[PDB]
Every structure is written in structure tokens, then in C-alpha cells.
Amino acid sequence: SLLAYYRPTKTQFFTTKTEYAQILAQKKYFAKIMALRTCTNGVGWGAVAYATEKPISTQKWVIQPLNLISVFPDDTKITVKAPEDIAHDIVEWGQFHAGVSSGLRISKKATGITGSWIAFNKPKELDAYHGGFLLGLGLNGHLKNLEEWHIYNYLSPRNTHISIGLLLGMSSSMKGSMDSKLIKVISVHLVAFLPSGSSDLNIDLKLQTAGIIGMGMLYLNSRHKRMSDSIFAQLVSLLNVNDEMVADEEYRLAAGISLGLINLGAGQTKQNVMYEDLTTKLLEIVTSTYDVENDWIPENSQIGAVIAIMFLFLKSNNFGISNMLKVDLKEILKANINTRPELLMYREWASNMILWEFIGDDLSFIMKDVDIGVKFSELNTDLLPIYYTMAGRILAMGIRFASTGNLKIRNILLSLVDKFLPLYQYPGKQNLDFRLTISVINVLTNVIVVSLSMVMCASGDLEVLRRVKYLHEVASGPYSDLSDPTAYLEDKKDIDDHYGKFISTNLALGFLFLGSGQYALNTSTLESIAFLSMSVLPTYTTPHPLQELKHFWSMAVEPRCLVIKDISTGDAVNNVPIELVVEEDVEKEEVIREISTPCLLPDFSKIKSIRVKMHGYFPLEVNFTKDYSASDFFSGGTIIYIQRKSESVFENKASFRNVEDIHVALKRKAAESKNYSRGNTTSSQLVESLGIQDLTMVELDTLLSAALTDSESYNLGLLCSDKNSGDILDCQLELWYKSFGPH
Amino acid sequence: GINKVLDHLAPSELIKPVKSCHNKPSVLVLDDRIVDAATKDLYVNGFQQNPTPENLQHMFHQGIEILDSARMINVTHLALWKPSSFKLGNPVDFALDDNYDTFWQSDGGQPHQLDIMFSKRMDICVMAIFFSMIADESYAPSLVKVYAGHSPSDARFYKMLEVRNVNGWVALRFLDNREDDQLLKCQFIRLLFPVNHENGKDTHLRGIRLYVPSAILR
């Protein structure tokens, strides 16, 4: 109810005023804020519904349009309209996000989704919904070979959203095939890669960023020099927009992630010369200090260089590169410091990910080498680097323990979020130093909630929900309680801040309930860390760079849900206790973990044995040795079936080997009475009435009926003197009766 | 120790007094007909018919000398500049040449932009602008808004400047942002000129300067 978007949204408003006009203005302000929320619920609804609905091919898809109409407890409906109430771009950006959610809802293994199907579902009028929907199908892996007929039909209008959706989705569908017929299309799109001296053709900057991210992701694991060096030149070089030179942070971030994704896993070298040359060039970019601002190497490429160096040596444990990348707080706080402070977060995050064996789970790793060391404890810009320091360390920490769950990490983040929550969005003393520091606080608290959600994904935890609910509700800010274009920009800054605050909390809400809780993220395969790290990129500040990438974590989501089914009946059996053997995410020996049946077991490679025990079905225990792993065992399916024991009269011939506890007998009697409430009607009672309960006794009674030749006599003696059997004492008496009884 | 440094980093109950900011953007008075100690600090040339252009040149030079007379460091040439648009007659060089006769002119949209990009974290203390109401009335800047930030991404409003009659250098030291340092600490400064006097279209800039703290053989 909190996260749904297709319906009026319940709102809470403070309005600590009595005048009617002032109350109406705040309600209208809250309505605008709620419109931002409705726009950004795309990120959340994608994660809530991953593979829920299945397609029928013949059936026609439908996309519910954004409602963005808020309802107050007074039930005086206020409707937001564009572009009067909110920025115009925001509404169809949310439409694009909702479309991406709608496209991803289709399952991966669904068949029949060919190039004709999308054209069949075309709305005959291009809009943001269809571009997003197209992106969703492409991202899931359905646009493997899309026909060239209607690629031009889609791309003929210069609309950015459909083009962005088409480029990203299709590139994600092939995902590393190095096909010519498609890489050439983006090559046409990208202006800088176009042959030099050609007359400039109008291409939107966001479209260029969309094309370049698709190419890098298209060239995944390709290790192709002719493209990587060109991509590197793209990061360093300068662009042309509207016939005037422009330097874009957005485009350079895309170039950095592009270079990192193409050459993923190419840094574990002990090509090496050329990799060393590229590595030292990127390090030169990130470490160069310029007293005078050079035109073609601004600070905007620092994040891209840093992000590029992230993917070169991912999961390589190269201490030296991390040390030259990792920044020491004690040294820098002494100095004046240089470069944009936001680079520090990315640098330390990169350094921590390189050493993919020592990501500390304790507050000491988070709180390592941090001290205010100044008399003025009031919030000042001098202590921004430590906030960015904190942000990077916790982000690496959260991604490291992704979906595996833990208690100490959750508690530490709970303490951190409880501490950092009150300061959030508090414009008390309107000072630029204070305002910048608390904007960093907003970024930091967005990171802590997202990271806390990342570690506890798919569990439906209570306190994480408690914190993410609070961040979601209550706009706060300058309005409420806690020259015309100039006013437009003043309002635009605040509304963009609210949009950035809303995307983070929506991501946490979606991640907490991923695929209705039965799907979880994967961090085993090398490229999975790449997509997970790529999608969690904190871009919450203006202008929210590379937002359309936020819906990519779907590459990392995979099942990992274990349920038990019966064999004879063929139906599911639930609510049976399961004991689990794990490594406790450490080198410790073992801890027994008791869970219910529909529960997400941890990663298969870390599980050594699993057993099922419950009163009724006989137990099944399997221990996984080095030869076969849990992943290989569950490769056929994540469901293991169990056989049903038998309550048979023939089993209890004469003596009850079963303990037959009084407690379980009473429970069984009550359970049978429940069905009876909702007698000689069973065949077991019939055979009991017939008196042929003892199989061996009746057979030997028939055999002894008459003789008693020597061979069968010795045979009956042998069964009587059996080492282990059932009604031996009963058998002994009949021979005595047959031998020496009345006749 | 860990908890206390977090509390110093994140003071929860210590900072927030009442949360009752008025939130309106503060407006600075630039008029030169009233004599006050605060205006004399920000207005240098002194309060005064309209002077002839040669008198304007004379007082232009005297203001430059007076501003440079005090213990100061000029880093105007230590940053990257990118205006909204040129007009192919005079780039920002004639704005930064410290010459009254020459000037820079933009030509384009009404909300004119002047971008100041820094290479290193420099702590600017005194912001100097020269205006000429009588000499350039057609292209006189009437409304000025000065931004601040560490990057083009995080540019934020700092102060307003309304122009009525200022034929001289204007000194702009910053104290609201940081009372302890009495100076501004940013890497990104941009200026806006959304409207001119008597409903003008374009805008000149006679002078601009940035201030920071810190016999022979031929």
C-alpha cells in the first residue's frame, strides 16, 4: 500500500499554520512532492515485481499511466498537472521508469517474444511508456536478434526516451556478442566516434550517454583494444553540443563505466604491457594536481577514471593499486585538500573493493582513522571528506555482504541510521557552509539506508522497513515544520533534492521485497559484482546523473528459494523444520541454523550439508562433499522432494517397534478428530476385523494344517530360532500347539 | 571515543535550536547616497551631476590602487572562465584586463551567465566588481545573483545584489556563510544577470577581480 503507484497516494501533511491560504499552499507543495514520489516509484515497483506475471503472447500488454494524484486525510483531492506544478521532464521520466518496470515484469524464460511481438504491442504513438517497456524487454534478454525493419521505425523520431530504451535494452540482450550489425548503429549515434570533420548532426547528450553505456556493456569481457583505447580517448576528450564546445560530467561518468565494463577481469595479470600503460594513464588522470584548470582534463573525469580503475582490478586483491588509490584521513585533514570532495567517496570505495578479502564487518573498519580533531564541532565544510570517507566504506561493506544477511552489520547500520537520521534535511541556520555539509548528510543517509537494504535484501526485515518508511514519508525541508526565473531555479533546486531523496528510499523499499521476497541478488559470478556495483552508484545529487541505469540490478537477481514437495501425491508440503550447515560467512567451523520451509537459504557454495526432519515423513539428510556442490545439486531445480512414510497395520504385525509417545499420539488423535468433525470406514479396520493381521502367523498356520516332513520341520525351527524377527514368541507357541496340542 | 567523534560529526540534539528559519533570500542594498560604516566597508570609491567618462577612468584607477594597496593576493588569472555566450567583439579578456576603456560583452539569452571555474580549493575573501551606471546605462546590470558550490552540479544561491546607482568599484566580502573564517571556501562560482536597467537586453562588464588571503644591472 505504501509503495504502489497506480492509485491515489495517501499523504501526511503538517501545516503548522491557521490561515487558509497558507494551508492551501503547503498542501499544494506536499502535492508536488507526492508527484515526485509517484514518478520515482518505478525503481521500487521493478524490484517488488520481478517475475510475477507471465505472458500469453496472444494477450495484449497494458501499461498503467502515472496517476500522480494525491489524497489528504481531509479528502480534499489536489491534482498535480504538468508543467505547472512540477518540472516537465519529471513526469515522463517517471513514465519511462514505470515502463522499464513493466518491461522487466516479463520472465526471462518466457518464449514467443520475437521482434513481431513488440511491434504488435506498439501503441501507434511513441511515448515514454513504450520506450521504457522496450527497455525492459531488452534488459531481460529478449531482444537477442531484433529485426532491422522496425529498428529504423523506432529510431526515426528524435525522441530521447525511446532511443535510450532501445539502445540499452538491445545491448543488454546480446551482452557481449561483438556483433557488427548493431555496434555500428551506436557508432553512428555517438558524435565523437563519428569521423572527424563531418557536419554535426543534432543528437541529445542523454542519448549519447545512453548509447555509450550500451556499447561498453555490449563489449563486456571483449578485451578489445581498438574499442577500449577509443573509449579511453572519449573519457579524456571534449564534446560538441549546439555547435559550441561543452564538457559533461554525465558523459564522462558513462565513459568511465563503459571502459570498466568492457575490460572486466583484465587486471589480475601478474596485453600486460598495454594494460599497465592504461592503468598508469588512468592513475595519472586521478592523481594529477593542476594549479591552473586545464580545459580538456577538468575534474569531471575524475569519477570516471576512478570508476574505470574500479573495474580493472575488481576482486584482484592488489594492495599497491589500492594504497595509491586509498586516501589517508590523517594526512589530508592536515592539508587544504584538492579536487571535488565527492571523488573521495569513490576513491575509498574503489580501494576497499580491490581488497576483496578484508571488507570489515565491524564498526572499526567503518570508523578507521577518523577523528574530528578540531575545537569547532559545529558542522563545517572542513569535515566533509570524512563523510565521503564514511559513505564509500559502508557502500563497499554493503555490497560485499549482499543478500547473505547478518546481525552485527545490521545492528551497526541501525545504530548509524538512528544517529544520522535526525540531522537529515534540517535547514536551521541558512549558511552555505552548513547547507553544503547537510547536503552531504542527505547523500550519506541515502547511502546508509540503501546499504542497509542491500545487506538485508529479500528478508522483509522490520527495523530496516521502519527506517526506510520514515525516509519515504515527510518531505521536511524549508517548508512545513521541523526575478521570476530566479524563483524557478530556487524551487527547482529543492524539488530536485526531494527527487534525489525519494529515489534512494524507493530503492531500499524495492530491494527489501525483491520479487515478492522469493528472489535474491547474486554475487558469485564476476560480472554480477560489476552490475551490482554499477546499479548502486550513488547519484542522488543534482542533476541525478545516469538515472536510467538504476534499473539494471535485475541482472544480479536469481532464485535461491527452497521448498519441499511430496513424491507420491506430487503436491507441496510446507511448515517442516529445516536444519542448515553454513560457514557463518567466516572461517569458523559450523553453526546449526533452524529455519522454516519457504526460506531463502544462503549461497550454495558455502553450504556443506542439509537435512529435513519432521514427525511423519522419514528424514532425509544430504552432506555435500568437495566432489559435488550445492549449486550443482540444485542445478536441475531448487526443489527437493520427500517420500511419505506409511501408517500401515502390516508394519505393526505384533510388537510396536515405534516409541509411540503419548504427546504425539494425542496430537494425532486430535488431528484425526478435526477431519472427522468437519467408525469402521477404513480398509485397515476391515483387515483388522478379518483377523489376518499377523502375516507370518496366518501363513504358518496354513502351512501346519494337515505330516510335518523333516525339511519343513527344520525350516520352521530355523524361523523360530531366528536371530532377529518379530512375533517370534507367538510363532513358538503354534508349533508347540501343532506338535503337542489337542487333535 | 568512536561514539563521541560520531556525535561531533553528527550532533543530533545539540545543533537544532527551534527550526524556525524565515527562508527568504536576503537582499543586499548597494545604494551610494547613504553613508554608513557597513556600506563603507563594502563600497570603496566613496559617496558623491554625473561625472565625465575621464573622471570615471580616473576613479577606476584609484579604486584599483586602493584595493591593491592593502595586504592582498590577486588570483583573478588563476581560474577558468566561460561566459554564457560571446558576441565576437570582445572576450572576457577585456573584462579582466583592469582597463575601463575596454570591456566584455555577451550576446544571447536574457538570463546571462558568467562561469568561474577553479582548479584548486582557493578561499576567496573579497569579491570585486566595477559598475558604470552613467557610462553603460543601456547595458547596465540591474539584478545580480551570486552562486556558490564545489562543482557545476552543486551550485547554490548565495546572495542578491540590486543595482540602482553605482558608478564605482564594489567590494563584496562574505561573512554570512562562515563567521569564524570571514571568507568563502568554494571551487565553483557562477553569476547571473537576468535583467538590465530600463529593460535592457545585453550587459557589459567593465571590471572583475578576485581577492584571496595567505638597484639593478641591465
Curated annotation (Swiss-Prot), chain A:
| Positions in coiled-coil regions | none
Q: What does this protein do?
A: Component of the anaphase promoting complex/cyclosome (APC/C), a cell cycle-regulated E3 ubiquitin-protein ligase complex that controls progression through mitosis and the G1 phase of the cell cycle. The APC/C is thought to confer substrate specificity and, in the presence of ubiquitin-conjugating E2 enzymes, it catalyzes the formation of protein-ubiquitin conjugates that are subsequently degraded by the 26S proteasome.
Q: Which domain of life is it from?
A: Eukaryota
Q: What gene, per UniProt, encodes this protein?
A: APC1
Q: Where in the cell is it found?
A: Nucleus; Cytoplasm; Cytoplasm, Cytoskeleton, Spindle pole
* More details: Present with 178 molecules/cell in log phase SD medium.
Q: Which family does it belong to?
A: Belongs to the APC1 family.
Q: Subunit structure of this entry? A: The APC/C is composed of at least 13 subunits that stay tightly associated throughout the cell cycle: APC1, APC2, APC4, APC5, APC9, APC11, CDC16, CDC23, CDC26, CDC27, DOC1, MND2 and SWM1. APC1 interacts directly with MND2.
Q: Which residues of the full protein are shown?
A: 917 to 1746 of 1748
Q: Give the protein's recorded name.
A: Anaphase-promoting complex subunit 1
Swiss-Prot record, chain B:
| Pfam families (alphabetical) | ANAPC10 (PF03256)
The alphabetized UniProt keywords are: Cell cycle, Cell division, Cytoplasm, Mitosis, Nucleus, Ubl conjugation pathway
- Where's it found, cell-wise? Cytoplasm; Nucleus
- Consequence of changing residue 85 to F: In DOC1-1; G2/M cell cycle arrest at 37 degrees Celsius
User: What PROSITE patterns does the record tag this protein with?
Assistant: DOC
List the pathway annotation: Protein modification; protein ubiquitination
Q: Name one GO cellular component term.
A: anaphase-promoting complex
Its GO biological process terms?
anaphase-promoting complex-dependent catabolic process; cell division; chromatin organization; protein K11-linked ubiquitination; protein ubiquitination; regulation of meiotic cell cycle; regulation of mitotic cell cycle
Q: Taking every annotated instance into account, which residue ranges of this chain make up the domain DOC?
A: 51-214
InterPro entries, per the entry:
APC10/Doc1, APC_su10/DOC_dom, Galactose-bd-like_sf
* GO MF, any single term: enzyme regulator activity
Family indicated by similarity: Belongs to the APC10 family.
Task of the protein: Component of the anaphase promoting complex/cyclosome (APC/C), a cell cycle-regulated E3 ubiquitin-protein ligase complex that controls progression through mitosis and the G1 phase of the cell cycle. The APC/C is thought to confer substrate specificity and, in the presence of ubiquitin-conjugating E2 enzymes, it catalyzes the formation of protein-ubiquitin conjugates that are subsequently degraded by the 26S proteasome.
Q: How does the record describe its quaternary structure?
A: The APC/C is composed of at least 13 subunits that stay tightly associated throughout the cell cycle: APC1, APC2, APC4, APC5, APC9, APC11, CDC16, CDC23, CDC26, CDC27, DOC1, MND2 and SWM1.
Which additional comment does the entry carry? Present with 1364 molecules/cell in log phase SD medium.
What name is this protein filed under? Anaphase-promoting complex subunit DOC1
Lineage of the organism: Eukaryota, Fungi, Dikarya, Ascomycota, Saccharomycotina
